[PDB]
Amino acid sequence: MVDAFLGTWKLVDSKNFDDYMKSLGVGFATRQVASMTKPTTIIEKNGDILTLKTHSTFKNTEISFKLGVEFDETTADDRKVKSIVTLDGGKLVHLQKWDGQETTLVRELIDGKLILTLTHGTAVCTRTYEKEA
Template identity: 30%
Template sequence: MSFSGKFQLESQENFEPFMKAIGVPDELIQKGKDIKSISEIEENGDNFKVTVTTGTKVLVNKFTIGQEAELETVTGEKIKAVAQREGNKLKVSMKGIESVTELVDANTIVNTMTLGSIVFKRTSKRM
């Protein structure tokens, strides 16, 4: 199954505790918690381009499976990380955060980010 497509955020769990834990200011957490972000994923072999638009903020990350890439985090920090693919899952570790994006069916993507005991889960549906 291909990850390619546009997906709109449908639900999220533990948004506030996770954003606080990674250092996002309270005012931005309040602004961001009700915005339905749109994720656009372009998959071309092992090459990916992921564009996440949340209100006026646009985050673009490009990476190749198994190769180190510079990825921008939610806080705007740029870090080096390696994405791995396991079937319908993309996994990446960034500064203590384990991120797993799973294509659960043709129209649903679930992104789970784990930091210590906080599990932040976002479910998005294909548009």
């Protein structure tokens, strides 16, 4: 179900990421470096466990989860959240909850590119990844 998302992906476009980070309370210096960073995202499965790595010259993260099963997560900006990832309309939807707040990280495939839409508050960021061979 999740197989077309699997592999290694490289950031090739970013819109409104500063808006998104600022909504989350990320400090100006972190936003400044992040705005010039191009992460690599690696999505792997082993049975129904998915592992999603984000690698960069600035911050690295890694999460493992089962679709539809809540997990604890500590984000790149150091939020401690309750998370769930599910498939919805063919999109990989990651919902994070903390302190009554929520953010969604939605991944979809369009013309072979991986489009990540990040929403928090009114901020909507779109980041595009292309697949590495």
